[PDB]
């Protein structure tokens, strides 16, 4: 709308601890180990570099990844994006800007999806290569792996997943 187009609020490359709450607008802030809570409203969040804590709550938020090496892991440490409260079975995740290697059970460079109920999280990572080919890692609080669909997750791999 001409009043607001939900333009993300540009934070800092510092560790941003900022909140969005009920505003239908959300904060972006590349660097740092951010803690960004967005609860109500439709939200548009980019976590960037580092190991981040991104909460989205309510709404069909779009948490999106142009953050490639910014969401990578190694045995020497992981810099991933741990997304909290993100499962009304209709939340939006976008990894199309990463291209995404695929979801072929974690081999041939693709990633695997797993869900742990004790963690209440569905982690997505690859493990075939670590020092040899440091893999990507993300985590989402919810069990929306049972809701794996193109409408839930946008990707740009040459084979659908
Ligand atoms: Ca930041
Ligand atoms: Ca960050
Ligand atoms: Ca919000
Ligand atoms: Ca929200
Ligand atoms: Ca949400
Ligand atoms: Ca990150």
Swiss-Prot record:
Signal peptide range in chain numbering: none
Note in the entry: Each enzyme of this family of C5 epimerases introduces its own characteristic sequence distribution of G-blocks in their substrates, explaining the extensive sequence variability of alginates. These alginates of varying composition have different physical properties and are necessary at different stages of the bacterium life cycle.
Subcellular location: Secreted
Record text about domains: Composed of one catalytically active A module and three R modules.
Full-sequence portion shown in this chain: 534 to 694 of 874
Function according to Swiss-Prot or TrEMBL: Converts beta-D-mannuronic acid (M) to alpha-L-guluronic acid (G), producing a polymer with gel-forming capacity, required for the formation of the cyst coat.
Protein name per the record: Mannuronan C5-epimerase AlgE6
Hemolysin-type calcium-binding repeat coordinates: 29-45, 47-63
